[PDB]
Design a protein around this ligand. Structure first.
Ligand code: R8E
Lengths: 404, 558
């Protein structure tokens, strides 16, 4: 028996265009889909289905096996009411508190659940061909599809049964499902944690479902960092008031008046200066001020999260997550044969996964790259079974330094 | 004509909508006669069927005579039905490019006859297609018919036909993996690697398979012969090219003649290397009427002559060998124009192309070169399924220096330097640290939003000072002027401090070309210097120097 899905009033299905794929990814998808069809998961469709969702092939995480990845970003936006405020899945505040969090793929669960017949058409996707030689191969889902937020929403009750014995027996373990994954957190010693995971994989396995470790409770600050120096220049002070000046307005209670006064008249940049010690009280007040949270900044569940990334150089990247500019809920860095696209893809994924753990939602990324570049390349390094929303930007000169 | 046995595509109107009910306009007796003849004939053939007055739908019919001829044709205005019919999936998503065609020993072109008429229409949809041949003037109920096949001009036809021809060809494509079939509109392109023997024969079992399905195709003697003229190309058996390009010699050129010209050149650009179109397009800017005459510019003339020369003599392209690799070569042609060639074997091109693009306001050859590489990469994937190996006119160190320091993430696939001038380079670099014993200009710009009047100046630390007035400017324009100023009065080494993130941003990207002459004037300057350092500070923050240029330029402006 299927549960009925209704697109949000007024919206129609997704008519997203299929990006071009290389011969190898196409062949890989043709095999994969040829098998799913035999197993009855999907069925070829007709011209009478105007809908479309992009599809890709990824090589997963440290794997040699091609995995199919469907991009339901658009379908998810249009079904948002069903999976979020109708069949919602509560996010556990305790998760980020755990010493160890293991992420498990649970996506094969959905294949044993049929999709409401009236909703299938919206899951249309196409396997393109090369040089438009032939028409693409068109298919639609017959079962709960991986990548669609309505799948866990629906599968919720069955996951609940599957996990009840493991839950009853280990009351201090937190299990959270976000999309195709299970997040399992514990405060157990690492050998006992890994042991409990194995135990959980056995339960999963009796129901058909066949990991990698985070340490949330060790996730810390990337405080705006002011320099510690001997013999300052106008240049360094200027830079200092600059950084200092921006850090304020974002940081509640910063001061610089002491600092400005040293910068008086028009003196060469390369001119050293003696520091007045009260300026030093600010240095230490702000410094001590900076090494703290923000105060006043709280996550609002009703608002979208945003993530900005800056390329620092040397395989180093910075980021901030916020709902209102300068009101950073979190900040961090990601560090690396990796080109920028690869490294950027890796940061995007790391930030996204922390974001799922802390808030149960993915951020909308502002990526310092060219759409086309990003578009042709990301799939080469993507390993996650989800895809966050993104948009392209041009990092502001200042922003980057202020975050180094 | 056979009407395919094939299954039917269920079809629907758009949610909340009912079929058309448009009134037939009274027709001339000759027109009514013409249609009655055409309709009785179509009904004889199964194509249409007579109905009653119980069906309440109607679409208008019309009868168009002939130019030169004495035959008649029936036109059905399916606009209303179309606007109520559900949307279908897109027919084709691109067209094949010949450079992507793999060479085959033998290829034959088969065109399905009466294509739409050879395929049945969803039984429950037939009603919505009702039409009426009106009777002589008012009097008498008209003759009502409805379609059984896909009607010419209806929204779902192209799609339904293609789906049908996909379902029908499948079987044969199973038991014939080694044969290539291209489906394009109502054509079939069939190629194999056999000896005419099992080919002329294989093409016969194919036709046969199609007849079992209601689909008639040409037979030898009627079957098209090579070179195939198709879609603007000439497909010979070992090469391809664009169809004859003739450039008009003309006294006066009108906007319409240049547009057509530019168009032919762009089409020729896929196989003729070096075609340039910039100077000719400039003439099309802001343009007047289609018939207005435009005096060729000297640059436009030199561009033209250069093009005729490239085009004097023919050029062809080769087909694709899946085993060899793809090499893409690019060259800077000038004024933001690039050209490339793609080959597998040195100098036997599969294709060519050009990249102009102005991705931004201010840019440089390094960003341009990488935009071109992206465009070509995307293109390769589309045509060949894989990326090419590049041979670029940029030294591997210039690239590394640039990529490394730039704020944005970039990434050129596998490439190699090839020394074909003009070579791509950066014309200046900003110091990373303040130049000792060089003058520090503290610059500033301000403009009255009200009068649009501005002042731009600098106060150095070597005592110097200056302030220029500007008339219809902006804060952006005054802030860039102040920098230019500082660069004019400073000599080989300068430290410049601004509170303009905007001018900072522009400059830190090493632009070498801009839409703003002011910006180009600054460029000319930046290149003349030995060393320039540039720094930024907040504004209206009594910063030594800032509050001083700030008071100078504020006065008389705000
Ligand atoms: N008209 C037309 C037309 C349009 C397309 Cl898009 C494809 C096509 O067929 C081929 C054309 C092919 O090109 C390479 C080739 N091998 N042998 C040939 N013989 C010719 N007379 C022309 C082209 C080819 C290869 C396979 C095929 Cl089936 C014919």
């Amino acid at each position: 028996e299927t549960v009925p899905v209704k697109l949000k009033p007024g919206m129609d299905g997704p008519k997203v265009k299929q990006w071009p794929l290389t011969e190898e990814k196409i062949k890989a998808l043709v095999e994969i889909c040829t098998e799913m069809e035999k197993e009855g998961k999907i069925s070829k469709i007709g011209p009478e289905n105007p809908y479309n969702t992009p599809v890709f092939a990824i090589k997963k995480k440290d794997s040699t096996k091609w995995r199919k990845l469907v991009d339901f970003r658009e379908l998810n936006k249009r079904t948002q009411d069903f999976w979020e405020v109708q069949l919602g899945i509560p996010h556990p505040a305790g998760l980020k508190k755990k010493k160890s969090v293991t992420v498990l793929d649970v996506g094969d669960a959905y294949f044993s659940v049929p999709l409401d017949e009236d909703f299938r058409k919206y899951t249309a996707f196409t396997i393109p061909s090369i040089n438009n030689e032939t028409p693409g191969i068109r298919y639609q889902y017959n079962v709960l599809p991986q990548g669609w937020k309505g799948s866990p929403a629906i599968f919720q009750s069955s996951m609940t049964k599957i996990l009840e014995p493991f839950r009853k027996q280990n009351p201090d373990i937190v299990i959270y499902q976000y999309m195709d994954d299970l997040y399992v957190g514990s405060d157990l010693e690492i050998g006992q944690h890994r042991t409990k995971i194995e135990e959980l994989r056995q339960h999963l396995l009796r129901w058909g479902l066949t990991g990698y470790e985070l340490h949330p409770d060790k996730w810390t600050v990337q405080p705006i960092v002011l320099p510690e120096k001997d013999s300052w220049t106008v240049n360094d002070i200027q830079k200092l008031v600059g950084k200092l000046n921006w850090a304020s307005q974002i940081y509640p209670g910063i001061k610089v008046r002491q600092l400005c006064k040293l910068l008086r008249g028009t003196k060469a940049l390369t001119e050293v200066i003696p520091l007045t010690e009260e300026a030093e009280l600010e240095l230490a007040e702000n410094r001590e001020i900076l090494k703290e949270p923000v105060h006043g900044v709280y996550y609002d569940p009703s608002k979208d999260l945003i993530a900005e990334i800056q390329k620092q150089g040397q395989g180093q990247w910075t980021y901030q997550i916020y709902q209102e500019p300068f009101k950073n809920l979190k900040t961090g860095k990601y560090a690396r044969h990796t080109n920028d696209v690869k490294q950027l893809t890796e940061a995007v994924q790391k930030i996204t996964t922390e974001s799922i753990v802390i808030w149960g939602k993915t951020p909308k990324f502002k990526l310092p790259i060219q759409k086309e570049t990003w578009e042709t390349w990301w799939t080469e390094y993507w390993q996650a079974t989800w895809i966050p929303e993104w948009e392209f930007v041009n990092t502001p000169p200042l922003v980057k330094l202020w975050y180094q | 004509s056979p009407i395919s046995p094939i299954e039917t595509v269920p079809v629907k109107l758009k949610p909340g909508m009912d079929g058309p009910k448009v009134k037939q306009w009274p027709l001339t007796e000759e027109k009514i006669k013409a249609l009655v003849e055409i309709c009785t004939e179509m009904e004889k053939e199964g194509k249409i069927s007579k109905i009653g007055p119980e069906n309440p739908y109607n679409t208008p019919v019309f009868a168009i005579k002939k130019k030169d001829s004495t035959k008649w044709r029936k036109l059905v205005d399916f606009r209303e039905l179309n606007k109520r019919t559900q949307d279908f999936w897109e027919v084709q998503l691109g067209i094949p490019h010949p450079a992507g065609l793999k060479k085959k020993k033998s290829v034959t072109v088969l065109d399905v006859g009466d294509a739409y008429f050879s395929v049945p229409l969803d039984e429950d949809f037939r009603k919505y297609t009702a039409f009426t041949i009106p009777s002589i003037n008012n009097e008498t109920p008209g003759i009502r018919y409805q379609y059984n096949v896909l009607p010419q001009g209806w929204k779902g036809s192209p799609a339904i036909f293609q789906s049908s021809m996909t379902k029908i060809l499948e079987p044969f494509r199973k038991q014939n993996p080694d044969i290539v079939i291209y489906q394009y509109m109502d054509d079939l392109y069939v190629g194999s690697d056999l000896e005419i023997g099992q080919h002329r024969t294989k093409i016969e079992e194919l036709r046969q398979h199609l007849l079992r399905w209601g689909l008639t195709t040409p037979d030898k003697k009627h079957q098209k012969e090579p070179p195939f003229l198709w879609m603007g190309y000439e497909l010979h058996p070992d090469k391809w090219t664009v169809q004859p390009i003739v450039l008009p010699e003309k006294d006066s050129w009108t906007v319409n003649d240049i547009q057509k010209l530019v168009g032919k050149l762009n089409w020729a650009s896929q196989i003729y290397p070096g075609i340039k179109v910039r100077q000719l397009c400039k003439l099309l800017r802001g343009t007047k009427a289609l018939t207005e005459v435009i005096p060729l510019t000297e640059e436009a003339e030199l561009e033209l002559a250069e093009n005729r020369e490239i085009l004097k003599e023919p050029v062809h392209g080769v087909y694709y060998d899946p085993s060899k690799d793809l090499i893409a070569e690019i060259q800077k042609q000038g004024q933001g124009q690039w050209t490339y060639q793609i080959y597998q074997e040195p100098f036997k091109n599969l294709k060519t192309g050009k990249y102009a693009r102005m991705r931004g306001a201010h840019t440089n050859d390094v960003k341009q070169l990488t935009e071109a590489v992206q465009k070509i990469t995307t293109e390769s994937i589309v045509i060949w399924g894989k990326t090419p190996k590049f041979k670029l006119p940029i030294q591997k160190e210039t690239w590394e220096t640039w990529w490394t320091e730039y704020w944005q993430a970039t990434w050129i696939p596998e490439w190699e330097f090839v020394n074909t001038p003009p070579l791509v380079k950066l014309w200046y670099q900003l110091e990373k640290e303040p130049i000792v014993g060089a003058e520090t200009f503290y610059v500033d710009g301000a403009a009255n939003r009200e009068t649009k009047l501005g002042k731009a100046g600098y106060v150095t630390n070597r005592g110097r000072q200056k302030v220029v007035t500007l008339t219809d400017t902006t804060n952006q324009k005054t802030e860039l002027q102040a920098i230019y100023l500082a660069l004019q009065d400073s000599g080989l080494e300068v430290n410049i401090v601004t509170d303009s993130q905007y001018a900072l941003g522009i400059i830190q990207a090493q632009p070498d070309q801009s839409e703003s002459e002011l910006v180009n004037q600054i460029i000319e300057q930046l290149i003349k210097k030995e060393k320039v350092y540039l720094a930024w500070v907040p504004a209206h923050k009594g910063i030594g120097g800032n509050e001083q240029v700030d008071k100078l330029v504020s006065a008389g402006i705000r």
